[PDB]
Symmetry: C3
Subunit: 132 residues, 3 copies
């Protein structure tokens, strides 16, 4: 099995590492690493980039997809706007989740809230051949 | 090849099992297993769960992704809000599809309508190693 | 490595083909093949199907996923409405990207603009077995 490296930045240190819940799980929940005293309200129609405080180190040949939580999508109409979000094996910046409120409630985002799921997947760079 | 188990519930009566159209197909189309003599109305901005009438039995090591139907996205602005929806090997509920109307017309959901596609894939759980420095 | 064939239609003449930025890139950017000195102005809440002028010949056992660019989603609220758009190995039509504007400002699509990314990956088909009796997936 490949190894996924995770660095917790300072604002993610008090939150758990991502992990698979069971041997059957497809993904790992990611949480909002906003400050405890800086909760936000995502208004209907609006979008916001939510920090996780994580840097991912994905080996060559793999990617991580950032997918929506189904519960939040159903209950509140919240989703990830750029889904599935593509984290490259090459990326060493912080992973951030772009949420959009496509419902009609004023949705509160708080530190520690589960906001998305990460799925680790193979990816290939094919030879690209122009043809007639 | 791995085997995907499918249970058809009673309200899926008369609807075929999902199947791949060809050896080249990446996904299987799912249909709306809603009551036969009713149209469900999905107004602009609204979302709703649509039953497929299927329980999937996905073997450990694999997942199913639920992806949008392109034709309904183009023609009516309809999509799957939580796309790509993740169904794991633990899940044994009925598969439901979360549609949202991001167009300007009343959209009518009818029995048998194709509403999404299912893509079956292996899933990998990498070893998670916390690191203090960029490698 | 497998080979992705790309046939260029007339309106993609003059444009760079899709290519990976680095050896670690998961996706390669797709460009709008609208006529030069033509524009698509996409108003808030509207969707439009943007031509790439490319046909992909993907070999069997693989698919291409059309996914959104993160920068357009963040900066403009633009996304791919049918994401991830599946292109299978049987598909020989022109690739067209279905953009929707979920932001507040107009979004102007111009020739050559990078409007999506394509991710190439293996795909499998399981055997399907009907059963009578008996996790992410529920709501």
């Amino acid at each position: 099995a490949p190894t996924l490296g995770i660095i917790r930045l300072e604002h993610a240190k008090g939150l758990d590492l991502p992990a698979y819940e069971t041997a059957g799980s497809a993904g790992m929940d990611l949480r909002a690493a906003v400050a405890e005293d800086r909760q936000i309200v995502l208004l209907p129609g609006r979008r916001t980039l939510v920090p996780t405080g994580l840097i991912l180190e994905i080996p060559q040949g793999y990617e991580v997809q950032i997918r929506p939580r189904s519960g939040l999508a159903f209950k509140n109409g919240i989703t990830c706007l750029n889904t599935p979000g593509t984290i490259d094996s090459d990326y060493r910046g912080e992973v951030k989740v772009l949420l959009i409120n496509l419902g009609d409630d004023d949705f509160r985002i708080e530190r520690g809230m589960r906001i998305a799921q990460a799925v680790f997947a193979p990816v290939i760079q094919p030879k690209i051949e122009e043809r007639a």
